[PDB]
Design an enzyme around this catalytic site. Structure first.
Site, PDB file in Angstrom:
ATOM      1  N   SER F   6       0.959  -1.257   0.071  1.00 50.55           N
ATOM      2  CA  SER F   6      -0.077  -0.051  -0.040  1.00 50.55           C
ATOM      3  C   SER F   6       1.019   1.214  -0.033  1.00 50.55           C
ATOM      4  O   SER F   6       1.495   1.521   0.884  1.00 50.55           O
ATOM      5  CB  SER F   6      -0.951   0.096   1.142  1.00 50.55           C
ATOM      6  OG  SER F   6      -1.992   1.114   1.150  1.00 50.55           O
ATOM      7  N   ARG F   7       0.830   1.876  -1.171  1.00 52.70           N
ATOM      8  CA  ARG F   7       1.634   3.093  -1.181  1.00 52.70           C
ATOM      9  C   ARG F   7       1.412   4.167  -0.427  1.00 52.70           C
ATOM     10  O   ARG F   7       1.979   5.284  -0.304  1.00 52.70           O
ATOM     11  CB  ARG F   7       1.811   3.658  -2.754  1.00 52.70           C
ATOM     12  CG  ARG F   7       3.151   2.976  -3.369  1.00 52.70           C
ATOM     13  CD  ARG F   7       2.991   3.447  -4.906  1.00 52.70           C
ATOM     14  NE  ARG F   7       4.218   3.041  -5.790  1.00 52.70           N
ATOM     15  CZ  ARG F   7       5.203   3.612  -5.864  1.00 52.70           C
ATOM     16  NH1 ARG F   7       5.392   4.836  -5.387  1.00 52.70           N
ATOM     17  NH2 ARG F   7       6.249   2.941  -6.463  1.00 52.70           N
ATOM     18  N   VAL F   8       0.125   4.405   0.002  1.00 56.41           N
ATOM     19  CA  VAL F   8      -0.231   5.330   1.405  1.00 56.41           C
ATOM     20  C   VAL F   8       0.767   4.559   2.570  1.00 56.41           C
ATOM     21  O   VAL F   8       1.179   5.568   3.452  1.00 56.41           O
ATOM     22  CB  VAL F   8      -1.555   5.605   1.509  1.00 56.41           C
ATOM     23  CG1 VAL F   8      -1.583   6.540   2.508  1.00 56.41           C
ATOM     24  CG2 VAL F   8      -2.113   5.793  -0.002  1.00 56.41           C
TER      25      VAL F   8
END
Lengths: 104, 105, 140, 177, 277, 140, 52, 52
Positions: F6-8
């Site tokens: 998850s790039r967040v």
């Protein structure tokens, strides 16, 4: 992967005879003698038949692998083992009594 | 990327500075030029790319040099598509890169 | 060295280098095969260890640095000093410095004789064996 | 009298002529030992090197001042320059003395060599110390081991070893402090 | 043609993970075996300083034991001591000596039969299955004393360090048959010792050489088990190396085939669309 | 778990779930590095065995039961139970039945203060830690 | 690769049970009676669940 | 697989040199001081070569 240590003994015989006949199918050529230095060997059909039959039956299991490499007959693997073996001691003792003097 | 290169080229040519350029994901530049060549009806070259892959890359990357006024230096993020360094987009990109900085976890 | 080939340039090369490069090629062939023989350091043979050190001698002999090409007589003399004796005292490390000492300390007339004669005459490799023993190798 | 001049330095000079030259000479258990027997010294005074061994343990390899061994004729004590001895040990207690403290090792039998250079090599199979012995199984062990005697000679030998071991163990566990 | 290379990549990858697991478990079993080996080395020393070390004796009957392994991924251990076994059987033999050849481990009967098929007489195996104990070595020595030789030869690999295993020949002489005869040098070297046994010195030497054979055998198959573990630790390390080499070459080959697949499948689409447009 | 990302990332997680997932993903990463090596069970390693057993403790926790979605405080309590070490009592074959023996047996006040506070507090990780010992975990 | 000797007998139990399950899934067919040799079976659902 | 104290006395010197080399490769950044607290240190080239 596993090396040769994990083979059966008939499998090690298979690997040894197969490396021997792999080297024995190699042959110097009379048109490759200009860039290899080795003179090229014509091998007659009866000679190569008898040689490969002898390696298959087991008559040359004593000879090493590299005596079969780039030789004509099954005589020349024996003479190359004779040449390779004799050197196995001849490595040095060329100290002086040279042609590299300063007056002769 | 040509617009960012023009903004850097003013500072190089007219201001005479040592500019940095950050082409973020040069692979996406390659991807977009591939899509533009595909929409224009051109026959794609190797793996799937534009026939003009080396030329569309060299049109960008040859304006990032040192002139007698100043220089532009590029820190271009590089993506490797199938984790394949022999893919034509990173293989063509690495022909221009003078350095690689690998950030690792 | 195993894959690169030039057969048309062979028998069209320097005769002085063709004398020395044949045993250079055979010793490098043996070095490649006794390195393929040793995928592992656990069993030493002390008969293959000789060619495994002669080959790492010749590999260090062969490498040169950029933008300084070497004339053919100073290549011939260096490979002559490598495939023969005259270099067995330096381990693997100082063979670049030893080759530079061979080039600098040997009398520069022998390069002229090797260049104009083209090959190594008996009167020339006499002075080759002579002049190579009076150089001082830095790995001792 | 010594018609086979054997030894490692003879095996390594005869082995070079009957074996392939590729194989190096095999090692021998003399090359992995350090303290010999006939060699000079190795005592220096009131202490002497006592190698108390076990197949699965090395209980002591220090120097002691006296070693009480449970020989088959009876308990003897080895002092510093003792007579050379190959003593077979009965089930009993070895005590290694090093001053005022005494470790009471009950062995189950074995041997004990005092060498000419003063090295004591106690060589037993099991050597339990006396605190890890229970006094409960030894008494029913002697009562049961004084009961079952068939016409087998093998079980007579095993039962005699049983009664002498458990009886020496009760003698050395009811007479402690 | 690109699912055979993918399943070969899967095969070589799980072989490499199996082999790294085998390497780490041999490295763990080498450390837990080094607890037992260095303790058992002590009891060998009193018998080798009391009876000496006489490998080349002129015995007219010997029982030779090659201490081999059970599992076979050692990497040239059992072959090395089979070479050493025949190179001692061609050395200590002098006059026509009956040699009984015994093997400890399954990998000895596979090769001593190939060397000495007629003199091979006994095969002990499954010995390292649970652990090695002195009662086990004692029973094996009892079965060797069922034959009555003048000498014993034990061929094992002395575990020195985690990389060095030297083959070792350990000789035990029969008590008054050959051992007392090899100790007398104009008198004796054994008559310095005051014998404190019940019965005669022949009986105390008969007990002492059985105990010496049991100790030598126990230490021999502890040393060989520790060298077995430390040699599997290096054989399964070179095999992970070669399974990483094969995997890297297969991945380069697979990426070439993947690129070529996308190119030819695209060229088919262009060739089909250019025939209609 | 290795390929999911998850790039967040951690900026948009439940705080309190953020306090246990940081060691949950590290412990699962180590278990993935020692994964496929648990086929050697009697062939023990005594240091990788702890991470192998704990990784098997954690992967059997994350399993779910098909249109039964769990509120975030109950998930946080289950991960806090399993990553702190309360579930090494539990046989690995019934951890999925052990978490109804954690969620239903912890009183529904820990869940309310964890939801309204929205993070693990020193008061709560004293309280529910005390509540995580009066649970009837299915051990043998 | 190895040969089912280093599995701690909790893996050998599921290897044996899985081989039993693998064989027990196979069933003769009444339309394959002329293929191999066997009269075909019809297993009920309750018998299937109880057997597995 | 062997232990950190299994190593030779020279390889432990290389471990202790490389472990303090790879520490020295890190650097606090001037832009990161609004959320890390520690101020950032610009390093010149001669200082880098001399220190390393």
């Amino acid at each position: 992967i596993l090396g040769m240590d994990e083979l059966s003994e008939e499998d090690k015989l298979t690997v040894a005879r197969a490396r021997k006949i792999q080297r024995f199918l190699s042959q110097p050529f009379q048109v490759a003698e200009v860039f290899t230095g080795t003179p090229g060997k014509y091998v007659d059909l009866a000679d190569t038949i008898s040689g490969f039959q002898g390696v298959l039956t087991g008559k040359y299991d004593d000879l090493p692998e590299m005596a079969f490499y780039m030789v004509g007959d099954i005589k020349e693997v024996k003479e190359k083992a004779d040449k390779m073996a004799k050197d196995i001691a001849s490595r040095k003792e060329a100290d002086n009594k040279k042609v590299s003097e300063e007056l002769k | 990327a040509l617009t960012g290169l023009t903004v850097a080229e003013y500072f190089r040519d007219i201001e005479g500075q040592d500019v940095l350029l950050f082409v973020d994901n040069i692979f996406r530049f390659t991807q977009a030029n591939s899509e533009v060549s595909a929409l224009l009806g051109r026959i794609p070259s190797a793996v799937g790319y534009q026939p003009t892959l080396a030329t569309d890359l060299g049109g960008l990357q040859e304006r990032i040099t040192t002139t007698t006024k100043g220089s532009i230096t590029s820190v271009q993020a590089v993506y490797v598509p199938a984790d394949d360094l022999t893919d034509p987009a990173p293989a063509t990109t690495f022909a221009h890169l003078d350095a690689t900085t690998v950030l690792s976890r | 060295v195993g894959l690169s080939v030039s057969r048309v340039g062979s028998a069209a090369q320097f005769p002085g280098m063709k004398q020395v490069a044949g045993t250079l090629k055979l010793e490098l062939a043996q070095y490649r095969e006794v390195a393929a023989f040793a995928q592992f350091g656990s069993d030493l043979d002390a008969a293959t260890q000789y060619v495994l050190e002669r080959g790492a001698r010749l590999t260090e002999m062969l490498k040169q640095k950029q933008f300084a090409p070497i004339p053919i007589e100073r290549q011939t003399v260096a490979v002559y000093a490598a495939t023969k004796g005259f270099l067995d005292k330096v381990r693997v490390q100082d063979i670049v410095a030893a080759e530079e000492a061979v080039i600098s300390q040997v009398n520069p007339a022998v390069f002229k004789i090797l260049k104009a004669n083209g090959k190594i005459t008996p009167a020339l490799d006499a002075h080759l064996k002579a002049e190579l023993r009076k150089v001082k190798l830095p790995g001792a | 009298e010594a018609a086979a001049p054997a030894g490692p330095k003879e095996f390594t000079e005869v082995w070079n002529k009957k074996a392939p030259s590729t194989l190096i000479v095999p090692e021998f258990p003399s090359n992995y030992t350090a303290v010999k027997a006939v060699g000079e010294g190795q005592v220096h005074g009131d202490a002497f090197p006592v190698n108390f061994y076990t197949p699965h343990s090395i209980l002591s390899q220090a120097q002691k001042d006296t070693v009480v061994l449970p020989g088959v004729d009876g308990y003897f004590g080895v002092k510093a320059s003792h007579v050379p001895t190959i003593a077979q040990l009965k089930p009993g207690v070895v005590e290694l003395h090093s001053g005022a403290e005494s470790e009471k090792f009950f062995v189950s039998g074995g041997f004990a060599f005092v060498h000419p250079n003063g090295v004591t090599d106690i060589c037993v199979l099991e050597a339990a110390t006396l605190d890890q012995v229970d006094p409960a199984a030894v008494k029913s062990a002697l009562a049961a081991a004084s009961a079952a005697q068939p016409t087998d000679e093998f079980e007579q030998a095993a039962n005699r070893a049983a009664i002498e071991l458990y009886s020496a163990l009760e003698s050395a566990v009811e007479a402690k402090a | 043609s690109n699912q055979a290379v993918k399943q070969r990549i899967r095969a070589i990858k799980n072989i490499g993970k199996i082999t790294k697991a085998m390497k780490m478990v041999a490295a763990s079993k080498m450390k837990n075996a080094q607890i037992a080996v260095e303790q058992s080395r002590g009891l060998v020393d009193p018998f080798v300083r009391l009876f000496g070390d006489f490998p080349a004796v002129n015995s007219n009957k010997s029982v030779v034991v090659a201490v081999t392994s059970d599992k076979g991924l050692c990497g040239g251990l059992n072959s090395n001591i089979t070479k050493y076994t025949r190179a001692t059987l061609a050395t200590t033999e002098s006059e026509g000596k009956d040699v009984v050849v015994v093997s400890i481990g399954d990998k000895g009967r596979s090769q001593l039969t190939r060397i000495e098929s007629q003199r091979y007489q006994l095969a002990i195996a499954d010995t390292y299955k649970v652990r090695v104990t002195f009662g086990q070595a004692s029973l094996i020595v009892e079965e060797l004393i069922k034959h009555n030789p003048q000498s014993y030869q034990i061929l094992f690999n002395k575990f020195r360090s985690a990389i060095s295993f030297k083959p070792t020949v350990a000789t035990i002489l029969s008590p008054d048959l050959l051992e007392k005869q090899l100790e007398d040098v104009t008198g004796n070297s054994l008559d310095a010792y005051d014998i404190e046994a019940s019965h005669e010195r022949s009986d105390v030497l008969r007990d002492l050489t059985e105990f010496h054979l049991g100790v030598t055998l126990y230490n021999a198959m502890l040393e060989n088990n520790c060298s077995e573990h430390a040699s599997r630790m290096s054989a399964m390390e070179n095999s992970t190396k070669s399974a990483g080499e094969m995997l890297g070459k297969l991945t380069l080959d697979y990426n070439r085939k993947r690129q070529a697949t996308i190119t030819t499948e695209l060229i088919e689409i262009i060739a089909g669309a250019s025939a209609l447009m």
